[PDB]
């Protein structure tokens, strides 16, 4: 049975980047529904007893994939943030890979922002690493996650409107720009 | 040169089904941006001088299509509502076609609701008529519109979260159920 992941911060701790209200709905309602849906859809199927990751890696398009992908996406999303990150940029191997693959962190930010803002409709902008250690930015529609393509997901921006509408309404770009301030690079680095 | 369509009611007139705030953002920002984007993108292309409808019917996937589809979708959407419709259900030819194709109005509502609630991500539930006079319910992802497929669009529900999030947050089904009270069947009938 799939369980709600625990937030490593209080509901109001990401203010003013993300409001308490947004967390209450985004985590407390949307993620809860996705978890509930996955627990309802799986019993008696080949997916019963599989991890979220394994479902995302295996399932074809459909409700199971949609819900598993959203569980995985939101889990990594919420757990990649911290109220007051020590570092506002990655170091070590991740830092070097970003310099190698994007020229610099600042250029990476620019490309990540553009992917986030340019994704039409609902989805996720993802930074991932492939099996040869190369980084990629992808636009995952709807509930998709880079695990399906055999990539290892490192950092994401949720550009479903529910992620920002109560705080930014239509101003997605403004929301995206603020997210950099709450990324917990220690968490992200450990995903490499 | 693409113009904002005129709302046939005041911004606050659909309360409490849709709030003034929602109309101010949905019409006054989102639709405005789509129209602005058409005015930015179309002049100087093969689409210059064409109607929105013709662009939706002809353009491939991409930003022009996305914007045109959204302009058409929102135009029909906003103009299909009235604060106090004359009737709560369609009459005449449309009334009969609905009975023919869905068994009854009530069953049509049920199937329309299910398409609306079941569309994952951003999109539009559409009732349309084909060239032989037969009705169809489709789920159009993102900016898509039935005109692309050669159908004539009659009635839609916008299930992009921006359409309802300020008023219903995650409770899409509740929003969908309330819309029926403000459908201006006189407008919809004349689209047949
Ligand atoms: Fe989300
Ligand atoms: Fe909309």
Sign of CA dihedral B155, B87, B25, A25: negative
Contact call for residues B172 and B138 (beta carbons, < 8 A): no
Task: Report the alpha-carbon distance of residue B39 to residue B2 in Å, rounded.
Answer: 6
Kind of pairing, strands A123-129 and B123-129?
A: unpaired
Domains of chain A: 20-80 (1.10.287.990), 92-191 (3.55.40.20)
The contacts of residue A8 (CB under 8 Å, 6+ apart) are: A79, A82
Rounded to 10 degrees, what is the CA torsion of B53, B54, B55, B58? 130
Tell whether omega for the bond before B115 is within 30 degrees of 0, i.e. cis: no
Q: How far is A51 from chain B (nearest CA, A)?
A: 22
Q: Do B169 and A29 touch (CB under 8 A)?
A: yes
Contact call for residues A67 and A32 (beta carbons, < 8 A): no
Interface of B with A in 81-140 (CB under 8 A): 120-123
Q: How far is A122 from chain B (nearest CA, A)?
A: 5
Resolution (A): 2.0
Q: Do A165 and B161 touch (CB under 8 A)?
A: yes
Given CB atoms, is B160 within the 8 Å cutoff of chain A? yes
Q: A152 forms bridges with which residues in the sheet?
A: A129
Task: Report the alpha-carbon distance of residue A90 to residue A189 in Å, rounded.
Answer: 7
Task: Report the alpha-carbon distance of residue A161 to residue A169 in Å, rounded.
Answer: 8
B122 CA to centre of ligand 2 in angstroms: 9
State phi, psi for A158 to the nearest 5 degrees: -85, 115
The experimental method is X-ray
Distance from the Cα of residue B180 to its chain's centroid = 13
Quick count: other Cβ atoms within 10 Å of Cβ B142? 21
Which of B33, B122, B169 comes nearest A121 by C-beta? B122
């Amino acid at each position: 049975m799939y369980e709600m992941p625990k937030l490593p911060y209080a509901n109001n701790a990401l203010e003013p980047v993300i409001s308490q209200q947004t967390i209450d709905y985004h985590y407390g309602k949307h993620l809860q529904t996705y978890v509930n849906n996955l627990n309802s859809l799986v019993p008696g199927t080949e997916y019963e007893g599989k991890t979220v990751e394994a479902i995302v890696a295996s399932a074809p398009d459909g409700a199971i994939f949609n819900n598993a992908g959203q569980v995985l996406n939101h889990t990594l999303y919420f757990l990649q943030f911290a109220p007051k990150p020590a570092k506002n940029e990655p170091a070590g191997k991740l830092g070097e890979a970003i310099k190698r693959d994007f020229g610099s962190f600042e250029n990476f930010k620019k490309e990540f922002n553009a992917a986030s803002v340019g994704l039409f409709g609902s989805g996720w902008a993802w930074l991932s690493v492939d099996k040869d250690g190369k980084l990629h930015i992808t636009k995952e529609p709807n509930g998709s996650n880079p695990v399906r393509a055999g990539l290892k997901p490192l950092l994401t921006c949720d550009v479903w409107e529910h992620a920002y509408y109560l705080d930014y309404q239509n101003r997605r770009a403004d929301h995206v720009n603020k997210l950099w301030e709450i990324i917990d690079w220690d968490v992200v680095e450990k995903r490499l």
